[PDB]
Design an enzyme around this catalytic site. Structure first.
Site, PDB file in Angstrom:
ATOM      1  N   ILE A  67      -2.104  -2.550  -3.380  1.00  0.00           N
ATOM      2  CA  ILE A  67      -2.139  -2.433  -1.927  1.00  0.00           C
ATOM      3  C   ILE A  67      -2.125  -3.813  -1.225  1.00  0.00           C
ATOM      4  CG2 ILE A  67      -4.694  -2.324  -1.679  1.00  0.00           C
ATOM      5  CD1 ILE A  67      -2.000  -0.322   0.271  1.00  0.00           C
ATOM      6  N   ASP A  68      -2.769  -4.825  -1.815  1.00  0.00           N
ATOM      7  CA  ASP A  68      -2.777  -6.195  -1.259  1.00  0.00           C
ATOM      8  C   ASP A  68      -3.357  -7.213  -2.286  1.00  0.00           C
ATOM      9  OD1 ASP A  68      -5.517  -5.576  -1.063  1.00  0.00           O
ATOM     10  OD2 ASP A  68      -5.718  -6.600   0.882  1.00  0.00           O
TER      11      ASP A  68
END
Ligand SMILES: [Cl-]
Lengths: 216, 217
Positions: A67-68
């Protein structure tokens, strides 16, 4: 290789030819929000935000996507841990070890495996806070991911809850597996990587040699 | 009996639906009233009175969505892939795969709509008689609305038709896009596509599908 100018740091973005079709909105989208990102200390540092754009896309058939970046010590290469200390890359390596039989190794990197592009959906975070820059990268993140999925056959996202929203486009095989740093999910974590090759030549594509990631 | 209904401006005038569908029903009605007038100009597959009969299905017990792009060009029943006289090639080809997987050799028909945990679904809920994907322009936002509602319940979305489901966006669920059942010899890929669904369900720790339940003897 190519290059463009942006209004804020890192001022310059170098990218591989395959990324051309989306580079013009990327520049426009980034200048809008860049001021906000740089307010914060980030992971990774601004000079390493876009280094995965140097990767070719036409030879890729699997996208392993988080996601990041890591809350700290991000390198701009998704999941990469130069000293092999991050739980995620350690756990990923373990899975591959159980699948391939490789027991002696010093590290692992998803970015050196033929046909695999490791990707972070959001390209930065406020140091120590995961998904904290979601609001800024939003339009950029959709733009880039959708570009990836027209080249790859299998999108493998890590983090069930992390990817709770987020839209993706068909036709792409998409698996959302457990996050590598999740608790006793060793069985499902292992077979998620194993099932990817099964899925790849359902689409009649060459399998992934996951053992290529090992660092000795 | 766990059921509700709403009124729409045009045919089929009434829409009956299971409680699980409530959250999307007011936007469905608003969207349908917008396009129904243009839509009904055409003779359709299926008939308007069977457009929404899959809305009678519960969603809380579903974990797999088997999805086609739109109804059969002709003889649609309102139940996705269903062929009462067992003549449509899609359901005949689907039955073969399941037969090859389960060992059931003797059967007279097959229906996905009688398999526990499975909801058969058509992305567009109608088509102009004889023309595939022809009502996309009308169903567009309804289709996005309903599919998104299904995927917050199911664990695995299995779409059939590689080219058919191009350009379409969905929300994150395990998602497989297999060959159209009526594609020629893609037998290996048709077969393991169904086989892998139970595997993926157990990756997500969900009970498997008893695919043999679809057989009609
Ligand atoms: Cl990272």
């Amino acid at each position: 290789m190519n290059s463009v100018t942006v209004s804020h740091a890192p001022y310059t973005i170098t990218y591989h030819n395959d990324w051309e079709p989306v580079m013009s909105q990327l520049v426009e989208f980034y200048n809008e929000v860049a001021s906000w990102l740089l307010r914060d200390e980030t992971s990774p540092i601004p000079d390493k935000f876009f280094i995965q754009l140097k990767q070719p896309l036409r030879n890729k058939r699997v996208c392993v996507c988080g996601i990041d970046p890591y809350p700290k010590d991000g390198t701009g290469v998704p999941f990469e841990s130069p000293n092999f200390t991050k739980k995620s890359i350690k756990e990923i390596a373990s899975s591959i070890s159980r699948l391939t039989g490789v027991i002696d190794y010093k590290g692992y990197n998803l970015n050196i495996i033929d046909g695999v592009i490791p990707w972070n959906y959001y390209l930065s975070c406020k140091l120590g806070e995961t998904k904290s820059h979601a609001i800024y990268w939003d339009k950029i993140s959709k733009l880039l991911l959708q570009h990836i999925t027209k080249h790859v056959s299998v999108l493998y996202c890590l983090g069930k809850t992390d990817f709770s929203n987020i839209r993706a486009k068909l036709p792409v095989t998409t698996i959302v597996g457990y996050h590598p740093a999740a608790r006793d999910r060793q069985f499902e974590k292992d077979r998620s990587f194993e099932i990817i090759n099964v899925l790849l030549e359902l689409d009649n594509k060459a399998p992934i040699n996951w053992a290529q990631g090992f660092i000795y």
